[PDB]
Each structure stands twice: as structure tokens, then as C-alpha cells.
Amino acid sequence: DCYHGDGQSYRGTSSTTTTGKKCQSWSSMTPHRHQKTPENYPNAGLTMNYCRNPDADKGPWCFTTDPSVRWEYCNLKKC
Numbered sequence: 001d002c003y004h005g006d007g008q009s010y011r012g013t014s015s016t017t018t019t020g021k022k023c024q025s026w027s028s029m030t031p032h033r034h035q036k037t038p039e040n041y042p043n044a045g046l047t048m049n050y051c052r053n054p055d056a057d058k059g060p061w062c063f064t065t066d067p068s069v070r071w072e073y074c075n076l077k078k079c
Contacts, residue, residue: 002079007053007060014051015062017072023049023062031067051076
């Protein structure tokens with residue numbers, strides 16, 4: 001599976017970080033509260049806990065379900 005460019009068009013179902021942690025759902029505020037929601041980023045495709053890049057950083061990322069690690073980049077190769 002892979003992303004093109006900075007991955008803002010990535011709409012795949014990857015949901016694991018580079019260290020093997022599970023992504024938190026974007027509509028969830030636990031374990032991490034955040035403002036990267038569908039309402040604030042309507043074009044980012046923030047559904048379920050899939051790796052996405054709503055704030056146009058270098059590549060897809062996600063908040064993690066580990067209480068101690070707020071967010072990490074996705075386990076996903078560049079195409």
C-alpha cells in the first residue's frame with residue numbers, strides 16, 4: 001500500500017505507526033484529546049483510525065492508542 005507526494009491524497013486503510021502502535025480513531029478524544037476532526041478538516045478524509053495527513057505535514061500520521069505517545073508517522077511506504 002503506499003502514498004504519493006506528502007500523502008494528503010492517501011485514502012487507504014493503513015492504521016499502524018512506524019513503531020507498530022495502533023492508530024487512535026480521529027473522532028475519539030481518548031487517550032488523546034485533539035482538534036483534527038472531520039468538522040475542522042472536512043476535506044482530509046478523517047474516518048475510522050486510518051493514517052491521514054490533515055495538516056499537510058511530510059507524510060501520513062495518526063494519534064496513537066498508547067497514552068504515552070501522542071502521535072507518530074504511519075507505517076507506509078512512499079510510492
